[PDB]
Design a protein around this ligand. Structure first.
Ligand code: 3IS
Ligand code: MG
Ligand code: ZN
Length: 156
């Protein structure tokens, strides 16, 4: 149907970070190049059928992030909201987890809430998720060295 949410997010490529336009509908989560000059979404780079999503949760953030992903001291500025992306969340599907970084806690919340809504009736929703990122061939949370490894932490 229509776009539920449209945001510019920093996403981690399949093992590099890219700044992309993300669109959510009841059918698809998709991502696009952003045409900054014309102020429009550019060419589609990927799509995930919502029915394939098994898990959407927050990700324990990086220990030593670059400035682009540093969490500011607590408490909308035009530059910061397209330059800084320190709040990460994970979308889990058949082809492993996708890591998306939001510029604000509120934007990440909006996305996690709307994604949990659109996936609510999916057949393969999981009871366990990975609180930490997959990095250098292993999950930091449980040291498991397979991306499709069952979640090491039970969802509350
Ligand atoms: O590396 C990536 C980033 C991405 C986003 C989406 Cl929505 C789908 C697939 C992929 N693969
Ligand atoms: Mg537009
Ligand atoms: Zn784990």
């Amino acid at each position: 149907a229509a776009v539920i949410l449209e945001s510019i997010f920093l996403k981690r490529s399949q093992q590099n970070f890219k700044k992309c336009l993300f669109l959510l509908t009841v059918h698809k989560l998709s991502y696009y190049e952003y045409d900054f000059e014309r102020g429009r979404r550019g060419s589609k780079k990927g799509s995930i059928d919502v029915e394939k999503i098994t898990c959407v949760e927050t990700v324990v953030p990086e220990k030593n992030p670059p400035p682009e992903r540093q969490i500011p001291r607590r408490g909308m500025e035009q530059i910061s909201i397209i330059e800084r992306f320190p709040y990460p969340f994970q979308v889990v599907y058949d082809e492993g987890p996708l890591y998306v970084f939001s510029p604000t806690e509120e934007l990440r919340k909006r996305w996690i809430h709307q994604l949990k809504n659109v996936i609510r009736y999916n057949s393969d929703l999981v009871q366990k998720y990975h609180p930490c990122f997959w990095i250098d061939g292993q999950y930091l949370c449980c040291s498991q060295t397979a991306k499709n490894a069952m979640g090491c932490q039970i969802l509350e």
